Amino acid sequence: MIDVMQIQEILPHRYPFLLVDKITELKVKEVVLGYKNISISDHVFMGHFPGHPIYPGVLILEGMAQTGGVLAFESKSKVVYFTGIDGAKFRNPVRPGDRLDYEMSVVKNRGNMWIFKGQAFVDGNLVAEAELKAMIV
Amino acid sequence: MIDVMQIQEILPHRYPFLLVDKITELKVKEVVLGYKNISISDHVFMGHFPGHPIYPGVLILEGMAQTGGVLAFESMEKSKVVYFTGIDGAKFRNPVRPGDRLDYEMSVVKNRGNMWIFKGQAFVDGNLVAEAELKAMIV
Amino acid sequence: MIDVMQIQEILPHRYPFLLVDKITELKVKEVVLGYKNISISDHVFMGHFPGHPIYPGVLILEGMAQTGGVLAFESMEPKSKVVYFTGIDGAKFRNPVRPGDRLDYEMSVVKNRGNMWIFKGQAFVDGNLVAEAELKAMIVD
Amino acid sequence: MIDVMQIQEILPHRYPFLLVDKITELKVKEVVLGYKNISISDHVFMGHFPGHPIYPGVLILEGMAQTGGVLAFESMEKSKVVYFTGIDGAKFRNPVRPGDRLDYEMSVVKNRGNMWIFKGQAFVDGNLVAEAELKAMIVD
Amino acid sequence: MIDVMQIQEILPHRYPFLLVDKITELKVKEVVLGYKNISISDHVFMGHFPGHPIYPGVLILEGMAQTGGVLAFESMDPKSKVVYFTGIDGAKFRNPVRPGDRLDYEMSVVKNRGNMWIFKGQAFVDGNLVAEAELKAMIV
Amino acid sequence: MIDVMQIQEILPHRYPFLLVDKITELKVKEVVLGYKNISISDHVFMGHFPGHPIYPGVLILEGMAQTGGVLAFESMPKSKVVYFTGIDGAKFRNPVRPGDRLDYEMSVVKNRGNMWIFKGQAFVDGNLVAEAELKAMIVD
């Protein structure tokens, strides 16, 4: 498991595009679990619907991708490029107050290429899912 | 189970100074429970310590205050204002960090006409992180 | 066709998550062309790589999506319906998009069935494909 | 008698949570005077009241605290941290508005090894706007 | 004698491009005095020189312009029109403006002809000229 | 020819006050061409007119100035600063709006030791939208 300053020692992403607050579980070459707290203190809600705050779907995918990034990196001067997303589905809205849980499993690993099954939850409710393809450089 | 759209119907506070994400429990004239999610997506961490994100204690107080605002407002048999004129015995126990759910508890210790006194506490996973008594008014 | 103030009349999106600056072409029920100007004035580059500004791929998807929104809202038989994108498929990122780039969106309708829309989307910079995806949307009241 | 950059040369606080613009007077182990310019160019007013800009009281406290931080750090003779662990008898008098120069005054009432107790006051044109007793720790 | 809330009843400008905090004096068709508080709370310092906060000269010109806007709007007998600044001449920048400074604007009418206004503008800190320019405007 | 991280090695300006995205042509001691992409992603539109995004004229001047900065820095062999002390005959023609590419053009009309005079013009699809004469000096 891994806190945000540690994440930041691994991923190059910084505010305002760092979308993982904490990694709770990490099994090398296998699976990673982490989350992002969602709050109206978040600048996105200013414009992702005045009077109706909804966490943008595409940012959930980015959060998944970033969590997968750390899993990749743990399995460190080089880069993790996500070149593909497939079968992405959004289920329910994510709102201020939700803890957005990310789950990322390795489906395939071949030299420098990684394929993940990713899912996002809020209170055990699936909200998003997708298969992400990554490359390392 | 009272969300931000509805909190903003009650408080005039807006982003970037709305410090309550949800109110979970509200017993009129008595107690209010609510919380804020703490995330690195919060601009305060940009400056409240590069390479060392810590939620500023003073904002915990303000969140407490805002929660108490809601209780105050939702307890008048509309348009008045809730002015917090005092804070006492404020104590900061442990750091609040990105990833924490910051839980507020505000109980009314005294109420007389338009004056309210609150016992306030903030928690993360059942761990006291802040406390204070808050004095409020009405217009 | 449509400038930013007009898009804002159709789309509910506002800054900081309005990712279309202009719609240049719009043929109802068929195809929409629009773009976003990419500049270091953009807050994303603060954190999407200090000393290495790269436009986040996921945001290119959302710009495609917002363009397609406009097309949909212009494409049935009133207003306040909402257009929810429920799926994205075969999304591919080709080349980095950088400050200075005009990011060109193209969205064509591949299927339309009552309240369901399916788009082929592509984004370009000087005629170079940078991203593509199939977007599924549901338009509901 | 010090300016913003020198201040950053001392506190680790940065924008958008650096609430002191300038320190006007500094007597070691004794008292510190500094101020913050208040302007609608400040992000806080966007949300601390659409159509009614009021500088949040708690930010006045933090500005006092930061000023006291400098005084604490200046009584050295490097790298330690200044933790404010308590605030008491904090009272807010008048609203602080865009256009105000917010004057901080911080005196040491007690000093005990690594613990400091300050009387803090904030002014706008010589009008008391806030006050409190601030308790500070100071560790490696 | 006019503050921010009132300023905004007149100017359409909003944060983060509202560069007047207060108007201290206004004599119709003649002169306007107002100012902006400069503080590191201001986002411009983030990038107008990390480790060296300098208030951009062009923003001083804009603040002058905005203050003249108020004077123009106030001196007029319809109601809602717009004040378009079409020109700036002999603009000179003298001294740096830094966090902590009160930036004083002064705008005098040198010419007025129907819907055209020409202003002599000056900006000060502590009575030191920091910028000046002649600004031409048109009401629409 | 000069990309945005090249600009930043040269200019000290950073976001949110770096107003050049690219330099397309640079002839030493003669002329520089570069541009800025204008988008509603830009925070200025938040406040430079709710419901009516218009790129502030004074910021066009600053973009011109920054572009001329690079030219100057590229045309003499160390580190020093480029201070713009004057702007003259500045004229604003048409509004600049989200979606426009804002084209800068800076020619040297005079050069004497440490002093530069530029003729500057800004274009959007070949239409002049602003122009001015910029005076600059180079210091420690």
Curated annotation (Swiss-Prot), chain A:
Superkingdom of the organism of origin: Bacteria
EC numbers: 4.2.1.59
Record's catalysed reaction(s): a (3R)-hydroxyacyl-[ACP] = a (2E)-enoyl-[ACP] + H2O
InterPro entries, sorted: FabA_FabZ, FabZ, HotDog_dom_sf
A molecular-function term among this protein's GO annotations: (3R)-hydroxyacyl-[acyl-carrier-protein] dehydratase activity
Enzyme's top EC category: lyase
Pfam families in alphabetical order: FabA
One GO term of the biological process aspect: lipid A biosynthetic process
Localisation per UniProt entry: Cytoplasm
Alphabetical keyword list: Cytoplasm, Lipid A biosynthesis, Lipid biosynthesis, Lipid metabolism, Lyase
Active site, renumbered: H48
NCBIfam families named in the record: fabZ, PRK00006.1
Identification of the protein by name: 3-hydroxyacyl-[acyl-carrier-protein] dehydratase FabZ
